[PDB]
Structures are given as C-alpha cells and as structure tokens.
Symmetry: D2
Subunit: 232 residues, 4 copies
C-alpha cells in the first residue's frame, strides 16, 4: 500500500467514516479519516485557492482555502513527516466523484521543496499543455483546450460524471528529507473550480505526497478520493 499524506478539500460529508456533517478541509496522515478538519464554506462556481506548508523544524502541516472576497478556512496538525513519509516522494493532486458529482478543475499548481544539510525543487503551472510531459496523469485525469487540468471525467459541454477518479503527479521524484539535513520544508498552492448541477456535490480534490511508485488503489473511488484502498 502507498504511504499517503494529503490535504483534502472534501465536498461530500461521509459521516460513517469520520467526516463532519459539512464540506470540510482536512489533513490526512495515512488514512482518509482526517487527523484534523475545519468547516469549508464551499462556493460551487467560484475559483478557490489552497495554500499548504510545512517545515521540519516547526513540524506543523497547515492549509488554508479561500475565494476572492470571502472568509478563508484554515486547518493544521502537528506531525513530523520524516517519521511518516520516505525520503523520496512524488507530489500530486487527486480528485474523485462517486454517486454524486462535480467538476474537479485545477487552473494552477505550484510547489516548492527545500532541503538544507541548500537543495531545492520548484515548479509552477498556470497553463497545462495538451501533452504535459512533466506530469504523470493517472486514471481519468486529462488536460483541456483551455489549458486546465481536469482530474475527473467531464463533457466538453461542461457536464461532470460519477464513479470518476484521476490524479496528476509531478514527473520528478522529490527529496523531502535526509539524515544530514537541518531543515526540510515544502509549500504548495493550487487554484480550483468546482461546478455542479447537483444540490449536493461530491467528492473533492486533494494535494498529496506519497511513495514515488504511488498508483490509484482499486476501490479508492468516491469518498476515498483516489488515495486509499480502504477507510481505515
């Protein structure tokens, strides 16, 4: 099984497996049952931004989601990712639908990693090309004619579909820790557009970090957000 760390923008409350009964942002450490969550005041049809950060000295993974003009929502969890993740990871975005549905559109994605022992990786996309050779598209993930990343299946009409799962990983492995290292830190930002006709959209989007050979686990659809085999 993959080792997974994620920040979930969770649109659909699955109260039977630990979600609060509201759209929430959460921090997931090796389980879909977030270690910490916060009410997300969703706005179907607006562009949202997530920013995510961690460093190995503070040991505090935190995330904020916002929309232009709105109040933002934040969540944090104290954790030493050196004891959770392996030294080398791939970083990526995931998204699912299930019985309910939404567009999982990513308009932009940037990521920075630093390791001082200074080694660094940084990448930033404001367009996605039709053939993103520096992305590993998994599942139903694809790029569109506006240079956006659609993680889950959609018509060119506009209409999203159910039982869809797609991810996008940065092609290059990332070195997030080492024995020598004094500090390791990463920061990630993405902007996203969730539209739905459904009164109750589902399921959500994820930024995540995993072992390098990470793949969509089977039965990780809908509420497991493409990350987890089961809901332990």
């Amino acid at each position: 099984a993959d080792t997974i760390v994620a920040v979930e923008l969770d649109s659909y409350p699955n109260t039977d497996i630990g979600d609060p009964n509201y759209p929430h942002i959460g921090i997931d450490i090796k389980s879909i049952r977030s270690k910490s969550t916060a009410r997300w005041n969703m706005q179907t049809g607006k562009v949202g931004t997530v920013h995510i950060s961690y460093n190995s000295v503070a040991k505090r993974l935190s995330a904020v989601v916002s929309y232009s003009g709105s109040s933002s929502t934040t969540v944090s969890y104290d954790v030493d990712l050196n004891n959770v993740l392996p030294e080398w990871v791939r970083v990526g975005l995931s998204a699912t639908t299930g019985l309910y549905k939404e567009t999982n559109t990513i308009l932009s994605w940037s990521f920075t990693s630093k390791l001082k022992t200074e080694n660094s990786l940084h990448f930033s996309f404001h367009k996605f090309s039709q053939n993103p050779k520096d992305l590993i598209l998994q599942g139903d993930a694809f790029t569109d004619s506006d240079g956006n990343l659609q993680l889950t299946k959609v018509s060119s009409s506009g209409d999203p579909q159910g039982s869809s799962v797609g991810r996008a990983l940065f092609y290059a492995p990332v070195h997030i820790w080492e024995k020598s290292a004094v500090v390791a830190s990463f920061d990630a930002t993405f902007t996203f557009l969730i539209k739905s006709p459904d009164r109750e959209p589902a399921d959500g989007i994820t930024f995540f970090i995993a072992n390098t050979d990470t793949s969509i686990p089977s039965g990780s659809g809908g509420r497991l957000l493409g990350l987890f085999p089961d809901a332990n």
Copy 2:
C-alpha cells in the same frame, strides 16, 4: 518604545533577567525574557547557520541553529505576529558586547517575505560591500574588506571590544500583514562567526523584526542585545 520580535543567539547567561544558565537560542516577543529557549552548544571559532521561519496559518515561529558536522538546536513558539507587530516592519540583525566580548560577524543573510491577498520581497547577501546602500547600519555595525558585516567593534587587529552595539536593517520596509490577507509568511537565513578571547563570550546576535523607525534604544547594551530599553 519600539515593538520587537527577535530570535536571539544568546552566548552569555544573564540568570538575573531570566536567561537559563547556559548559552541558548531564544524567541523574544516584546521582551528580552525569551518566551521559549533551547540550549545552544556554541562552537566559538566555527561558522554557524540560523534558519528562521513563520507563517500566519501555522502561527508558529521557529528557528534552528547548526554547525557543519555537529548536531543542531531548535526552538519554537506559537504566536500570532499579526497581533504583535505593525503591518509594516523593518528586518535586521543586532549584536552586542558588554563587560565580556566576542566578534559578531555575519557572513551571509537572506530573507523572504510573502503576502497573499501574491506580494513578495526577497533579498540575499553573500558578500557585503564596503558601502551597503541597501542596509541601514546602526551603532558600531560596519562591513569589512573581507565582505563581511561586523555588528560589533573589532580592532584593526581583529580583536573584539566590549560595550559595543550594532545593527543592520534592510533599507526597504516589509509588508508582513494586511487585512485582506489570506497568508503571510517569512523565512530568514544568516551565517555567523563568533570568536572570543574570553572564557565566557558575550553577548550574542539576533535576527529581529520591528517598527520601521526602530533604532538602538539607549542602554540596550550587553545583555539586552541592542533591542530593548530595559529587561522587563
């Protein structure tokens, strides 16, 4: 009085005003009496590195000090700087000597600030020029023919003197918060060389953030590290 946030590398224990009884790294919020400290295994004569980071979501100010070879020391404190600091600041280094003394040599200094409402400021110095027009030098601070910044008095011969105070501020004010801000972060690194003829070197170095019109408070000498008017 100035408003001060600082990370202090305090080479000299002043137990009568709250220092632990050993050299330590501290986080100072509006007082010399550090809110959080950790033991610092000084290595007079060797080049040390300090990394400092904060962001407004995690609300944790952290610092780590390290020498090439040995293990390193960290210190953290949970604080919302938006309730401590004005919206515009200057950032700087300070150092002092009192009755006991040491060189307070800065070999390099970098700083990055970000404000997402993205606005940003990054500066990096590896070589300090003979006339650093982008620094405000206060007190005894000067740059030397090696391209280092000496915060405290050092003779023609290279011997440190007591009763010295100096500071260097980046010339441009930094926007560290604003109302409509989603997240504010900053990171700082400097490297430093402390040499002493005294069996107990003193008094230390700080990275500090302050009101833009900050100046050396009179009687901030020695154990108050060029930051504070008294020891309250």
Copy 3:
C-alpha cells in the same frame, strides 16, 4: 542631471524629437531619443504586459510588450550598462500626460536583480496598498482603492488629466554592478492599463533605472516621460 536607462512605452509620436511616426516601444540610454524602437500596436482599454531583461555577459537589453490574444512586439539594444549606470541604482516606473492624455495604470510589477561575485533582490507587487511604504511616489503617482498604482492624475470619476507626471521607485537601492562581479542580471515585468478619451492618447509609461537620488526633472512633462530635463 540624473543618469537614466529606460524602456519606454510611448503612446504618442513626437516626430520633432526623434520618435517614429507611430506608437512604439523604445530603449532609452541617457536620452529620450530612443537607441532602438519598434512599432507598438496599442490596444487602449486592454491589459498589457511588459517583460524586460538584461545581463552583463550577453550585454543585450531587451523588452517585449504583449496583450492577451494579439501578437507581441519586441525591441533590443546591445549595451554595457556597467559603462552607463552607476554601481548603485533605483528602479522605477514613470508616466506622463501633456496636451493629450490617458490613464497610466499599473496593475502589477516585479523585479529581480542578481550580482554574482550570489547577491540578489526580488520584489513583486500584484496589489498596491493604500500606503506603499516600500515605494517612493514622486509627482502625481498614487495608489487607489482597487489596489492599482496610478502614475498620472485621474479624477474621482476615473477620467485622466493632461500635464501630469508621476513615478514610483522601489524604496531600496539596487546593486547592479561591482568590480569583482562575474555577472549581473536583472528582469522586470509589469502589467498596465491605458484608457484614453483622446483620439491620440499620450504620452506613455516607462520602466527606468537611475542614480539612487533620481527625481522628476522639471519640464520632464509630456513627451519626455518624467525622465529627461530636455529632448537632447
């Protein structure tokens, strides 16, 4: 007099002092009489982008102007800025109106300098605050409640006025060369909105580099773009 290097977006042809007979992008070295120009297909009412770059090895200063959609214009000039500019500079934007007029609105501005002997300065503004303490505003320059920088007078109603000059300099001086330097580079981007009620808008916008104590030369109005004391 000041020493000026500038990239001019010159909306108004002043053929009597060397402008070509159309709107143009120019590179100005110590004179309003551009050393190199190219035709600029203005689109009053649309958001334009300018990118400028130089480095001391290639010795080529280049600029490109672009609107989303249409094709773009470029201009270059081979010059060793180390023989033109002092070692320390300020960097800024200027704009003017004369008898004819336009809005000279800056929506964003970024600048990166590097000096390898690495020393560097990066600043980026997407939103200009109501009180930009890291800018020196000269002349009619001001920031507005949209978070834009208006270089020239614009009424309560949003109508531009003639006989306006304004400039904005980054507060910190920039080290663009030193003896022991291997390479010096700089890059600048700004975005801009020019609206005009006049059939011939005027006079234009510049990005400029100058002596640190640069100020608006009297009679630099209109066609001299807030940079030059005369048209020599």
Copy 4:
C-alpha cells in the same frame, strides 16, 4: 540522432575538428564544431563556476566561466533556440576522457526555466545523494561519498581514467517553448573541479539541452564530449 545544444568547457584542443589550439569555452549548436569560442584560462585543481543564460526575446545564448580571484572568460552566440530545439527537452551535464584524462567533478548544479504565454521549473543541487532519483545517470556517471557528481570514471584514491563518458539529466522533461508563449528563458549554473596528473588534461565538461529521449551516442567518446555521433 539527438538534437543538441551545449556549452562546452573544452580542456583538450582537437585542432583537426575546429577547436582553437587552446583550452576554450564554446557554444555548440547541433555539432561539436562550436559556433563560437573563447580562450579558457584553465586552472586544474581549482573550483570553477559556469553560468549560462538565454531568453527568446534577446536570442543570445551566453556563458561565463570563472574561478575565485581570476579573470573570467565569456562567450555568446546569437541564435533562436525555438528553431533548433523541440518544445520539450531534458537538460543535463556531460563529460568525457579519451587518451588524455582528468576528473570531471560537478560540485553543484542549478537550472531555471520560465515560459510566459508564467510556467517555471527550477532545481538546485549543492549535494548529490548516493541515489539521486531525480537524475538520469548515463554512462559512467555516478555520485560519490562527498555528495559530488563524478561524470567520468575515477578511483577513490583520486586517479581519473581514459575512454570514459558519463552524463546526468534532470529527471523531469522541461518545456522550453510553446506557440502561445511571449518569452522563454533559462539560466543554469554549475561549479566543477578538474584535477589531472597529465600535463595536458582532457577532454571536458558540458551543459547541454536535448530531445527528451537523449542518450549517449556510440563513438561520442573523448573529443565529442558524450554529445555527438560524429564530428560534422
């Protein structure tokens, strides 16, 4: 055959295939016969630095090599790499020995690419790990116990070998151009240590950019620097 653009630090004069009769730096466009060169004042046993830059507006690929304290050497060539290279490339370093020999030690390597239509890639290594998962090592290339990259074969004693070729490519494809794009630019820096017992060291080191599936061509040893099948 690969499409190759390179900057060669050429230690061994092969006058029969277009080299000047001296150690030189050159710019190679689809042939080992540099389009432009300049005398390199080699210093076997000192750390050298190369910096390389290009942008699509200026159309000037330039490189500078230097050592601490020395005079630097520079070379440039005007070229539009959009008409030479494909949209997607891998970037890398190469090195050979032949009958004569030298260490081809890389101590550091950084690279930045930007594409404005802003998309960007940046990576920086000051150590190389024992298993660099974000590098594609080709030929004899390997990382060592000091976290340096040895492009060509060496004893742990110190002693280099002949008939050696190795390269190192960044794992992620890089997008250096697109139809939409206004500007594309890249910058690269590496530091290097060439030691030799030979009175006449050979052959040299390269930074290069190629089609993504680039591989060491057979018979590209010694003077062809791992890049080219023949000396056309």
